[PDB]
Amino acid sequence: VCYKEGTGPCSESEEKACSCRGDMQFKCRCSL
C-alpha cells in the first residue's frame, strides 16, 4: 500500500516509481 498522507494516496506515476521511504520488509510512504 502506498499513500501520500495528503491529497489521497500516491499517484499512479508515484507507486510505479516507488525517494519514498518505508517500513521493514520494504515523499509518500509505502508499507504493509
From TrEMBL:
Compartments in which it is found: Host Golgi apparatus membrane; Host endoplasmic reticulum membrane; Virion membrane
Disulfide bonds: C2-C30, C10-C28, C18-C20
Recorded family membership: Belongs to the phlebovirus envelope glycoprotein family.
Name of protein: Envelopment polyprotein
Native source species: Dabie bandavirus (Severe fever with thrombocytopenia virus)
Entire-sequence positions represented here: 257 to 307 of 1073
